[PDB]
Design a protein around this ligand. Structure first.
Ligand SMILES: Nc1nc2c(ncn2[C@@H]2O[C@H](COP(=O)(O)OP(=O)(O)OP(=O)(O)O)[C@@H](O)[C@H]2O)c(=O)[nH]1
Ligand SMILES: Nc1nc2c(ncn2[C@@H]2O[C@H](COP(=O)(O)OP(=O)(O)OP(=O)(O)O)[C@@H](O)[C@H]2O)c(=O)[nH]1
Ligand SMILES: Nc1nc2c(ncn2[C@@H]2O[C@H](COP(=O)(O)OP(=O)(O)OP(=O)(O)O)[C@@H](O)[C@H]2O)c(=O)[nH]1
Ligand SMILES: Nc1nc2c(ncn2[C@@H]2O[C@H](COP(=O)(O)OP(=O)(O)OP(=O)(O)O)[C@@H](O)[C@H]2O)c(=O)[nH]1
Ligand SMILES: [Mg+2]
Ligand SMILES: [Mg+2]
Ligand SMILES: [Zn+2]
Ligand SMILES: [Zn+2]
Lengths: 351, 346
DNA sequence: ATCTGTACATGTACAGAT
DNA sequence: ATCTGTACATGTACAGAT
DNA sequence: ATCTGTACATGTACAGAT
DNA sequence: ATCTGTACATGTACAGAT
């Protein structure tokens, strides 16, 4: 009932060292070769540095090591941003210059830069004979260049081109990241001293803010006590709750295409808010994993029904606004969550 | 009570402003001089350390601690006679070498000479250079705002540099600040100041590590921040420093004791009692009293290990005579059992 | 001769294996 | 409870450039 | 190789609220 | 007496300019 059953699900979700080892060896080979090709010659992307992000590098990837996220980030000095129609997250970017090939009268085209980035990667991937690796068909309005690796087992790698700016963060984030009562003001001041990132979303010239680096730090430094989850401190169940929520969404999403609008970033955003609401490490005791997961489920259901889930970093941006996800989709997911909740999570046994 | 003592010890905003603006004028000018030359100390950077910059200075802003740190390349250390804290150094600076050995005395002397020269050229501030104490690592400036202000200018070598093996068991913050903090702190450089054990020796300095700890001292990240709870850790350090300053004023028998003994002791207490709730402001009396008992127990056992170099006993019979320690135990036991009368004398 | 972008060397938190 | 592979931060060597 | 500009932590000082 | 909110002050990390 309480602690158990969910501990059994977590056992299923745990990655195996052997799988991790084989997956990481291939992924690192491909990524380091693509990073090297970016440094060659008159490449506009010379200087890009690598930044590993997403669930695998936060240690909340579940089931298999089959999806990796890596940012190829390019420091770009004197830039001026114009917010795209008070949306908070989307921007136009303006200013001998290797990026002039993508300029458009002051304005740096996102899809032109991404196309050349994409073109380079496809070419370098053709020269790989070690590995069975190809490039996925492009999704319109997607920042990523996704590699598909057959190791025999299947592995996705989303390479995200990112602009790196070191100025202070855009005003729309000033009230975001409300970690003052949880990680504190010094951590917040230091995190906002780090660069911010822009990824390719006036349709084709817009960029979107990314905070994958800040999210990575928070996930690996998630406690009010510095010793949380350390070898001389107490274990918490924050990440374990994130895993169970991720797994509930993944299971439901591979069954019902009604849920196409939903994604793991909604789960990640919601639990960041829960962690803020419940800052104390004792509110995430491993013994109370059932209650901790249940109160996360209830908070997510409230967000669905009230149609309100604010971006953790950009408070005026509501990821559940009617313009992004239709009410019926949200009602559909509310019922499937409430059902799983009241019937012993039968979907955790599925497959 | 103890609150009233802390109100007396609080520095005044006005005095801080006047003293800092004078001190910064002098320090800036000396630092410029070390850069602008064929100076062999070209490259020194400033690092503000000690109680004023840790926010545990008491009574008046009349003592300032500044390191001019100089990054040096491939240096090898040899530990001086198993002491832990004292090293010979080996491999611009050729003017201070010996037989492969970089001389603390010879480098300090030139450092000292340059500073005294620049001080002669200062005609807007009343500022002299105190007579040198043998063995000491400091160049001390005496400023008269009109009030008296001390500035200890400490030359420091910077290496980076796995910390020397004598510190491997040091800094035992794992259950308090944690392993990530400890690992990151020990990724910082380590420092060497020209305190002689004789003439060629340097001593390990961890002033940059103690500063981080003083300002990052809670088990909770929010300790003492605007969205956290206040603790009484620093106020306990202030009262313990005040007890010792007042006792040292009065008895020359305590000349061998210094505020760093108190700082070392409270680092150990803070490790013993990591929880922030064990330093609740409402328990200021219990907290000060358990700090008193811990310090007495150190005196009674003649054992107070360097927080960063655990084999180095600051209370060894070699460093402080048994009689001095018994004298300080009786005077502390006395103040304790009579309501600290020494806190009432201005 | 000296300089330097790249990659190795070192150390350890995290978390899976045992 | 201990042992151990990956990721990562920082320090340092050096073939190839200068 | 040096310096200002910016942002906010750490303080002190004091009135009004509690 | 203590707490909370605002005003006032210094110290410090680091971006951007030079
Ligand atoms: C802002 N950031 C996003 C969005 N989607 C993804 N990200 C960021 O991109 C990272 C990787 O994306 P995903 O692979 O889709 O999600 P994940 O965090 O790695 O979790 P998984 O489903 O296990 O892969 C996330 O951790 C986020 O930081 C979004 O819609 N808005
Ligand atoms: N590391 C990182 N990866 C990102 C980020 N944003 C997107 N990605 C990757 O790119 C994938 C596609 O991003 P999205 O466009 O937001 O996801 P989507 O499935 O296309 O959903 P929508 O575009 O919102 O309709 C994500 O799943 C991530 O793997 C980011 O900010 N950081
Ligand atoms: C190692 N470091 C020392 C020793 N003495 C002083 N220090 C360091 O130098 C700093 C400044 O020393 P002091 O001015 O004498 O003491 P303080 O900490 O500033 O405290 P005050 O008495 O208020 O001046 C200390 O905080 C220590 O980090 C010592 O004996 N061994
Ligand atoms: N910032 C800093 N200052 C130091 C350090 N060590 C010494 N000092 C300063 O130099 C002063 C004299 O240092 P001491 O360690 O007392 O040397 P000493 O007076 O010759 O020897 P003692 O008799 O043991 O006191 C201290 O009061 C500090 O102000 C250090 O490691 N860092
Ligand atoms: Mg992912
Ligand atoms: Mg001092
Ligand atoms: Zn934890
Ligand atoms: Zn505190």
């Amino acid at each position: 009932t309480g602690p158990d059953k969910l501990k059994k699900v977590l056992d299923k979700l745990r990655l195996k060292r052997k799988d991790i080892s084989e997956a990481a060896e291939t992924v690192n080979k491909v990524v380091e070769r693509l990073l090297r090709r970016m440094q060659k010659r008159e490449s506009e992307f010379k200087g890009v540095e690598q930044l590993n992000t997403g669930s695998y590098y936060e240690h909340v990837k579940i089931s298999a090591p089959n999806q990796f996220n890596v940012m190829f980030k390019l420091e770009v000095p004197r830039i001026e941003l114009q917010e795209y129609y008070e949306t908070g997250a989307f921007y136009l970017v303006k200013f001998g210059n290797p990026l002039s090939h993508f300029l458009e009268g002051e304005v740096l085209s996102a899809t032109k830069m991404l196309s050349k980035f994409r073109k380079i990667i496809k070419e370098e991937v053709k020269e790989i004979k070690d590995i069975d690796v190809s490039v996925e068909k492009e999704k319109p309005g997607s920042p990523a260049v996704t590699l598909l690796i057959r190791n025999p087992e299947e592995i996705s790698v989303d390479i995200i081109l990112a602009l790196e700016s070191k100025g202070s963060w855009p005003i729309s984030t000033k009230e975001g990241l409300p970690i003052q009562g949880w990680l504190g003001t010094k951590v917040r001041t230091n995190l906002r001293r780090e660069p911010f990132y822009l990824v390719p979303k006036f349709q084709g010239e817009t960029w979107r803010l990314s905070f994958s680096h800040t999210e990575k730090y928070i996930l690996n430094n998630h406690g009010i006590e510095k010793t949380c989850c350390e070898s001389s401190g107490a274990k918490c169940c924050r990440k374990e709750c994130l895993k169970l929520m991720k797994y509930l969404l993944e299971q439901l999403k591979k069954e019902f295409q009604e849920l196409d609008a939903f994604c793991s970033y909604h789960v990640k955003t919601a639990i960041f808010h829960m962690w803020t609401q419940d800052p104390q490490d004792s509110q995430w005791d491993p013994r109370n994993l059932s209650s901790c997961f249940d109160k996360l489920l209830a908070f997510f259901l409230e967000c669905l029904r009230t149609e309100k889930l604010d971006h953790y970093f950009i408070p005026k941006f509501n990821l559940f606004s009617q313009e992004l996800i239709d009410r019926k989709s949200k009602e559909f997911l509310s019922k499937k969550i409430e059902y799983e909740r009241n019937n012993g999570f039968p979907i955790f046994d599925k497959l």
